[PDB]
């Protein structure tokens, strides 16, 4: 089962959107997911991993993922 | 040093909502002492929470679900 | 016909989280019988919930916060 | 105070993102907001209103708002 990690900058007030994305994944892949973990992190960081594979990086992407895009990148890995 | 919290909830009992909430309560209160809070979709009737390997909540055992205050406190006692 | 629910929570007591949760519990369970669920940031110590004008929860009165089940039930009795 | 309404398609599984956006606003404008209301709606609808002014329409915008953009559109209509 999939192991998803979400790292978000602790003081950038990004927990909200992280918890949301977390539930979007838990809701859509309730049976293919082992767990979705939220990692409070340091400045400007927002990165998501699926089974060890980075499926999102704020700077790289220049922003935050849409629910649809994230679901899709996760789907392609499971 | 940094707490590891695991939340197991019955996948089909519609308990994700309350699990995600409790997760945010902890992440919000212990934003600096927590390594991560993990949500584990599980099987029938299960709702159990662990902190650094220590079970701090079991639905049957407790006969229900934890209040935000009680859970924070049980986590706090394990973080110091 | 469709229920109107209002949730007043103390703005600075860090109660938005639990309010947003309860709001989603209701929207999820009564997605077809609810007109809307409104969250009202309020003043000190206040946490009160109304359904179609009827108060179904008062923190002091109840001495705490409602369980998802109890709140659903009190709302259900005012719809049905 | 501002009055915000969020209409989302009830069966499109859009409550989640609606509740999130709701909290983003309640958190950022905790003192300038009267209330944020979530309205479960019909097919394909996702529209947001602020003090009677439409600040978002899914088709019109061809998608969903970023937290920053929505905050901004609300701020421009708010009693500064």
TrEMBL record, chain A:
The keyword Membrane does not apply. Keywords: Redox-active center. The lineage of its organism: Bacteria, Pseudomonadati, Pseudomonadota, Gammaproteobacteria, Vibrionales. It comes from Vibrio cholerae serotype O1 (strain ATCC 39315 / El Tor Inaba N16961). The keyword NAD does not apply. This is Selenoprotein W-related protein. Disulfide bonds join 9-12. It comes from the Bacteria.
């Amino acid at each position: 089962k999939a192991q998803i990690e979400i790292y978000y900058c602790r003081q950038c007030n990004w927990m909200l959107r992280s918890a949301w994305l977390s539930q979007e994944l838990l809701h859509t892949f309730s049976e293919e997911i082992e767990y979705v973990a939220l990692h409070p992190d340091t400045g400007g960081r927002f990165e998501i991993f699926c089974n060890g594979v980075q499926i999102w990086e704020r700077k790289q992407e220049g922003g935050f993922p849409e629910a649809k895009v994230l679901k899709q990148r996760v789907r392609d890995l499971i």
